[model samples]
Target: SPLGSDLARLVRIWRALIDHRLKPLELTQTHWVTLHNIHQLPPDQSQIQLAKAIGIEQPSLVRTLDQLEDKGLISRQTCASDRRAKRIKLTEKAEPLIAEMEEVIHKTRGEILAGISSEEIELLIKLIAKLEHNIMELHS
Candidate 1:
């Protein structure tokens, strides 16, 4: 049987490990995960769209945006047609930092980094994708 507690605990533990390593840089899952999604999601996505993609509440992401803007890591562009529209993009300065996040995430998985081969990685990804699909189905 699928156990949400197991998955939740595993996810929290992994994120905590990453956050510990990123503490010196003042980064957290909240920071880099949002940055990575913004980097990949198509341009001109509104606040709601981005929040949905990140699986977080819109207000929560709005505050995170405030912090990112304060750090000059992201910029919010207002649509001319609709002044209320706020679209997000990574600032020019975010490129190198995002790369560093990727580097850190890779090392954060150092247990698999040493022993797990590509086949294991691929299988793990496949299984997780299946679980991801089921999680969505379970909700609605």
Candidate 2:
């Protein structure tokens, strides 16, 4: 339970708090995450390529991208050579949104990670390695 549930709970709590902070702008984790990834990843990354980077299925991300497009925050260009691929880009509209998302996210992290010292943060990193070993052993 310690290894499994505590981590899940921590993530749920963090997500809820951040979502609350972003609600006023009509933004959610899904929106900000997609926008942030688009801003950070290479300009030429296509729809499917972007999907894997965000750890989401392409179909689901297609729907997400449609929503962002309707919001005027993200736009896509049809690739000249690859008719099936769309190159994604963020609009000037998204600049302030991304800035606000970062501000809220940074503040939220400071709140949650405040008491944890650097040395203890290192302990969590090592613990993650141990879990990864156990987890990897189960892979086929």
Candidate 3:
């Protein structure tokens, strides 16, 4: 279980660092992730789908969405494909916000992955994705 332990520890440290750095911007780790997910995921992705992707409960995600909407970084619009569902959309303001977030991500990643080669990082990314897929399969 070293792998799981290490992964969890790393995430904890990474989140702490991000949260600290984002303090001036009035953002938390969850806010950073929620914004990033909304900005990066497909525009057609519904709230429920995004909530799932963010690994957050629907009610919790809805609260986050409300705050983000209040910040004018994102909006919820009726899904064309599903009348009952609402799709999350990033506003023009999100572009600059996302850019700022990307800066935080780049700096944090660099600090955390110090001295790691590009190839190693790529391999790690691939392996983590594969591992996540395996985990999903196991649970499924």
Candidate 4:
């Protein structure tokens, strides 16, 4: 239990590391994740849908969408089904950038796990996934 006391520390460290890695692109990790989710979904999605898919709040997504739109990385077009809802979509430029970003993230993560064994890595992922599921379920 004492060893696991560093849970928040681990979370903060990952967030900081991800933030630093994406800083050069002028994109936050949340922005990338939002786009990734939308891209994985149907062509366009509403703020509410996108936020839910990305496991973040809608109000938080509004600002992130604004930032992404301002940078021309994504666009929020009006949803055909709902006159008031905007459907989020990525630009052509974001495709390649997404791949590049993934590579960078992979490299950064590899460096972080430099000497850790595969079994340890698996256990870590499982543990974190458990926590994530618990938190998400709580909010659900």
Predictions in order: lDDT: 0.85, 0.87, 0.86, 0.83
TM-score of predicted structure 1: 0.81
- Look at candidate 4 and tell me the lDDT of residue 48: 94
Instruction: Compute the lDDT of residue 68 as modeled in candidate 1.
Output: 89
Q: What are the per-residue Cα lDDT tens digits for candidate 2 across 48-122?
A: 999998879999899899999999998899988999888898889889888878888888878878899989988
TM-score per prediction, in order, is 0.81, 0.85, 0.81, 0.80
Q: Candidate 3: where are CA atoms >4 Å away?
A: 52-57
Model 4 is weakest, by summed lDDT over 10 consecutive residues, at: 2-11
**Which predicted model would earn the best TM-score?**
2
Clashes (backbone N, CA, C under 3 Å), per candidate, total 0, 0, 0, 0
Q: Please state the error at residue 79 of candidate 1 in Å.
A: 1.5
| Highest-scoring model, lDDT | 2
Better lDDT candidate (1, 3)? 3
TM-score of 3: 0.81
Error of 4 at 47 (Å): 1.7
Q: Which is the winner by lDDT between candidate 1 and candidate 4?
A: 1
Q: What are the clashing pairs of model 2?
A: none
> Residue 110 of model 1: what lDDT?
76
Residue pairs with backbone atoms closer than 3 Å in model 3 (clashes):
none
- For candidate 2, the TM-score is 0.85
* Per-residue lDDT over 55-127 for candidate 3, one digit per residue giving the tens place of the 0 to 100 score: 8899999999898889997888898777999978888977877788779888887888889899999999999
